[PDB]
Design a protein around this motif. Sequence first.
Motif, mmCIF file in Angstrom:
data_model
loop_
_atom_site.group_PDB
_atom_site.id
_atom_site.type_symbol
_atom_site.label_atom_id
_atom_site.label_comp_id
_atom_site.label_asym_id
_atom_site.label_seq_id
_atom_site.Cartn_x
_atom_site.Cartn_y
_atom_site.Cartn_z
ATOM 1 N N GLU A 184 76.641 47.343 117.374
ATOM 2 C CA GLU A 184 77.097 48.476 118.151
ATOM 3 C C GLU A 184 76.274 48.622 119.428
ATOM 4 O OE1 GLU A 184 78.759 51.955 116.143
ATOM 5 O OE2 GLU A 184 77.151 53.121 117.073
ATOM 6 N N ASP A 185 75.037 48.129 119.380
ATOM 7 C CA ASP A 185 74.115 48.187 120.509
ATOM 8 C C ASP A 185 74.597 47.336 121.672
ATOM 9 O OD1 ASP A 185 73.646 45.511 119.837
ATOM 10 O OD2 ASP A 185 71.616 45.833 119.105
ATOM 11 N N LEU A 186 75.645 46.559 121.420
ATOM 12 C CA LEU A 186 76.165 45.575 122.381
ATOM 13 C C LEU A 186 75.085 44.623 122.868
ATOM 14 C CD1 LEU A 186 78.839 47.480 124.310
ATOM 15 C CD2 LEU A 186 78.664 46.712 121.942
ATOM 16 N N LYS A 187 74.011 44.514 122.096
ATOM 17 C CA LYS A 187 72.906 43.640 122.451
ATOM 18 C C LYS A 187 72.724 42.541 121.410
ATOM 19 C CE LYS A 187 70.389 47.497 124.691
ATOM 20 N NZ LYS A 187 69.993 46.913 126.004
ATOM 21 N N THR A 188 72.733 42.928 120.135
ATOM 22 C CA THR A 188 72.364 42.021 119.053
ATOM 23 C C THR A 188 73.478 41.711 118.054
ATOM 24 O OG1 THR A 188 71.372 43.925 117.900
ATOM 25 C CG2 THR A 188 69.916 42.507 119.161
ATOM 26 N N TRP A 189 73.188 40.781 117.148
ATOM 27 C CA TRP A 189 74.170 40.262 116.209
ATOM 28 C C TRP A 189 73.766 40.453 114.760
ATOM 29 C CZ3 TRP A 189 78.505 38.450 118.561
ATOM 30 C CH2 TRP A 189 78.387 38.084 119.914
ATOM 31 N N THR A 190 74.752 40.754 113.922
ATOM 32 C CA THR A 190 74.571 40.701 112.479
ATOM 33 C C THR A 190 75.267 39.457 111.959
ATOM 34 O OG1 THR A 190 74.297 43.071 112.052
ATOM 35 C CG2 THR A 190 75.231 41.728 110.303
ATOM 36 N N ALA A 191 74.489 38.522 111.432
ATOM 37 C CA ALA A 191 75.041 37.318 110.838
ATOM 38 C C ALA A 191 75.187 37.592 109.351
ATOM 39 C CB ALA A 191 74.124 36.145 111.079
ATOM 40 N N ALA A 192 76.064 36.866 108.674
ATOM 41 C CA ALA A 192 76.294 37.153 107.267
ATOM 42 C C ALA A 192 75.523 36.198 106.363
ATOM 43 C CB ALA A 192 77.777 37.147 106.945
ATOM 44 N N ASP A 193 75.829 34.911 106.441
ATOM 45 C CA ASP A 193 75.109 33.938 105.626
ATOM 46 C C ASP A 193 74.077 33.178 106.461
ATOM 47 O OD1 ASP A 193 76.137 30.751 105.785
ATOM 48 O OD2 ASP A 193 77.453 32.233 106.755
ATOM 49 N N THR A 194 73.571 32.075 105.911
ATOM 50 C CA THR A 194 72.527 31.291 106.581
ATOM 51 C C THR A 194 73.091 30.312 107.621
ATOM 52 O OG1 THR A 194 71.627 31.232 104.324
ATOM 53 C CG2 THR A 194 70.232 30.357 106.092
ATOM 54 N N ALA A 195 74.313 29.831 107.397
ATOM 55 C CA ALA A 195 74.935 28.869 108.299
ATOM 56 C C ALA A 195 75.141 29.461 109.678
ATOM 57 C CB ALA A 195 76.258 28.403 107.738
ATOM 58 N N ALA A 196 75.153 30.794 109.744
ATOM 59 C CA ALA A 196 75.441 31.534 110.976
ATOM 60 C C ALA A 196 74.181 32.064 111.647
ATOM 61 C CB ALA A 196 76.401 32.687 110.687
ATOM 62 N N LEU A 197 73.104 32.164 110.869
ATOM 63 C CA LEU A 197 71.832 32.728 111.340
ATOM 64 C C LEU A 197 71.114 31.822 112.346
ATOM 65 C CD1 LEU A 197 70.771 34.604 108.096
ATOM 66 C CD2 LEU A 197 70.211 35.514 110.390
ATOM 67 N N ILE A 198 71.665 30.634 112.572
ATOM 68 C CA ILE A 198 71.189 29.772 113.650
ATOM 69 C C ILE A 198 72.127 29.848 114.862
ATOM 70 C CG2 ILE A 198 69.937 28.263 112.073
ATOM 71 C CD1 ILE A 198 72.201 26.281 112.272
ATOM 72 N N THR A 199 73.360 30.298 114.628
ATOM 73 C CA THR A 199 74.288 30.610 115.709
ATOM 74 C C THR A 199 73.858 31.903 116.397
ATOM 75 O OG1 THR A 199 76.310 29.443 115.021
ATOM 76 C CG2 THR A 199 76.596 31.537 116.177
ATOM 77 N N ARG A 200 73.174 32.768 115.653
ATOM 78 C CA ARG A 200 72.645 34.013 116.198
ATOM 79 C C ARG A 200 71.418 33.762 117.079
ATOM 80 N NH1 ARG A 200 69.350 38.225 112.438
ATOM 81 N NH2 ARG A 200 69.181 39.988 113.910
ATOM 82 N N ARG A 201 70.548 32.866 116.628
ATOM 83 C CA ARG A 201 69.327 32.560 117.358
ATOM 84 C C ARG A 201 69.623 31.752 118.610
ATOM 85 N NH1 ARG A 201 64.458 31.424 112.895
ATOM 86 N NH2 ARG A 201 66.023 30.454 111.522
ATOM 87 N N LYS A 202 70.807 31.151 118.663
ATOM 88 C CA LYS A 202 71.238 30.444 119.868
ATOM 89 C C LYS A 202 72.254 31.274 120.664
ATOM 90 N N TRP A 203 72.343 32.564 120.351
ATOM 91 C CA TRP A 203 73.303 33.444 121.003
ATOM 92 C C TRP A 203 72.627 34.636 121.661
ATOM 93 C CZ3 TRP A 203 78.921 34.524 119.170
ATOM 94 C CH2 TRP A 203 79.630 33.318 119.135
ATOM 95 N N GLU A 204 71.502 35.069 121.092
ATOM 96 C CA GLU A 204 70.719 36.177 121.652
ATOM 97 C C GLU A 204 69.791 35.705 122.769
ATOM 98 O OE1 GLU A 204 68.628 38.397 118.647
ATOM 99 O OE2 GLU A 204 70.478 38.983 117.609
#
Length: 384
Positions: free
Chosen positions: A241-261
């Motif tokens: 909601e902050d329009l800044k950060t991401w909530t990832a669900a599993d682990t396969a996505a938690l590296i898509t988050r670190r390459k997105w922020e």
Amino acid sequence: VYLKTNVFLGGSMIQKTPQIQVYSRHPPENGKPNILNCYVTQFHPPHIEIQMLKNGKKIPKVEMSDMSFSKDWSFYILAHTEFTPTETDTYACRVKHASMAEPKTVYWDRDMGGPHSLRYFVTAVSRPGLGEPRFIAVGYVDDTQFVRFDSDADNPRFEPRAPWMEQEGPEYWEEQTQRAKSDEQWFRVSLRTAQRYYNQSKGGSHTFQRMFGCDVGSDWRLLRGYQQFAYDGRDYIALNEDLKTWTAADTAALITRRKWEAEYYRAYLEGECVEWLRRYLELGNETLLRTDSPKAHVTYHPRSQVDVTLRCWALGFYPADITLTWQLNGEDLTQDMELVETRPAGDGTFQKWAAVVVPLGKEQNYTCHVHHKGLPEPLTLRWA
């Protein structure tokens, strides 16, 4: 307007049984032509086969809505056909879906027993062995579809699905088509990544969803801006909601988050999206800003010698949001209420009903209340 996903991503299939409602558009009257609706919702995966039958046999001409989903990611579809009820002919809708052993047949049972948003729902489905993935995208202003894109049409492009969108010129359609055609490639890549990742077989079809857009209040401030994805029906990544950060669900996505922020999406969600929403509202003001209040009424369905079903209807309303409530002496009864999910009539208006089982001879004490935006104040009705 369409938003481009500005970055690629790096790198457990559930199944949901469809619910089905079968109902006519307008009140039935023998011999008078009508539309019969088969509304299928709440299902995953999206591949589904849907028939409508007269007296046991398949009706060949049946329109299908573009497919879309709701925010829990589950899919819906509305099938309908022209018909003229008689006293004798039977009508059913037959559904075949991966989540069920046999096909499921639901008979037409002739008795049955502000703020604004601009939203897109996007879906890509790989058909390995049957070509490249099928891409679909449908836009909504509030409860009204207005644009669609389907990779399956030949030379596909963004198209108006509300007649009031015909006002926009080629500049619009070109730019939107170009953004859709770009997102599709993204989805191809993304489908390939996800597959590789989980070691999945090249056979299985898989599903990738995206939802993005605008919630605005009375004061026209952004209540909620969205950019989120599901894989195989399950949450995957969501802009917060902050329009800044991401909530990832599993682990396969938690590296898509670190390459997105950030500003990129904030620019769209606070800027362009709210701007075009405002624009879409003017272009379609005569209808989007309408307010069809609901045609409520109570019907009566007496089974046993002790108790009967009372059903509060609400017909022909827009927008879709609504509250039906059953009451006994000011007391609330939403506990032992059966209450179908709200359904499209097909003409741009909506339908819903609520039911309760009550002691025969006491149907007069119970009271239904219909709270809709298009209502001066809550509506009051019962049975006589």
